[model samples]
Target: NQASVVANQLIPINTALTLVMMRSEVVTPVGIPADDIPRLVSMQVNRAVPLGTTLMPDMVKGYPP
Candidate 1:
């Protein structure tokens, strides 16, 4: 839980930074070119943008009825 806080946010803002690099092919931070992203993010990118959190999609679950 110690890693959960630092300068004071629930979770580190850059926690996904490394995963973003490892799974660069599946992540894009915006304004970054597809080819160049591999170097910066450290892997190839999927270039597809999904609508919500991949882990737990709350929006879709709570979709308006």
Candidate 2:
């Protein structure tokens, strides 16, 4: 499973994710685990993601140093 963008939107740096921002979905082959979705909450995204894109670990991070 992976977190997919519900629509075309821009998630600014330091902006935490919310249910309105994305939804969890099952992915074939391999992808982020569905159980890990909660870990993404309150975490910042590395960059702006387009619609229908999967949220990956590399794309998320803690506060900048």
Candidate 3:
């Protein structure tokens, strides 16, 4: 599974992610596997994230890192 933006959200850098920012969905046959939706909680964004964007490791500062 992967995380996807549920609505149009503008996330600034260093902003911690919450459930309202994204959702978990089944992955496509050839889609990239990213961190789980729950794992995204408290993770900070590394850049300005736009809507409909898939959550990626590079996009956020991982927790406990």
Model 2 steric clash pairs: none
lDDT of 1 by residue, 1-65 (tens): 11110011122222322233222123322323233322332222223223231221221222222
- Candidate 3 Cα outliers beyond 4 Å, as residue runs: 1-8, 25-35, 63-65
Residue-level lDDT of model 2, residues 1-65, one tens digit each, is 34332313557666788656666565553445555656666777778866666666567776221
lDDT (10s digit) by residue, model 3, range 1-65: 44343313777777888878775455443222434666667778888887756555567675332
Ranked by lDDT, top first: 3, 2, 1
| lDDT of the candidates, in the order given | 0.24, 0.59, 0.59
Worst 10 residues of 1 by lDDT: 1-10
lDDT of 2: 0.59
Q: Candidate 2 regions off by >4 Å?
A: 1-9, 63-65
Worst 10 residues of 3 by lDDT: 26-35
Clashing pairs in 1: 25-44, 25-45, 25-46
